């Protein structure tokens, strides 16, 4: 049906707008950018004026 085809096109448009694999990739890239490592030292005197 033409209505079914139009609904399928609209749903495909919504799904393309909602991939989110790039969102997960952005999160992983943010984690890689952070890449911290700490706590080998505990008592760290943060002497600040």
């Amino acid at each position: 049906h033409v209505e079914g085809q139009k609904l399928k096109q609209d749903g495909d448009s919504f799904r393309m707008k909602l991939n989110t694999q790039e969102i997960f990739d952005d999160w992983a890239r943010k984690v890689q950018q952070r890449n911290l490592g700490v706590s080998g030292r505990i008592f760290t005197i943060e002497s600040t004026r």
Partner: peptide
């Protein structure tokens, strides 16, 4: 009677503690 003479009981100052701690951090 040997009055008092109780070693002048007092602790290191918190600023003095900060100084010694900064010294330790420099040693760290």
């Amino acid at each position: 009677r040997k009055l008092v003479h109780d070693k002048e009981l007092a602790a290191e100052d918190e600023q003095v503690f900060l100084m010694k701690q900064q010294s330790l951090l420099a040693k760290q």
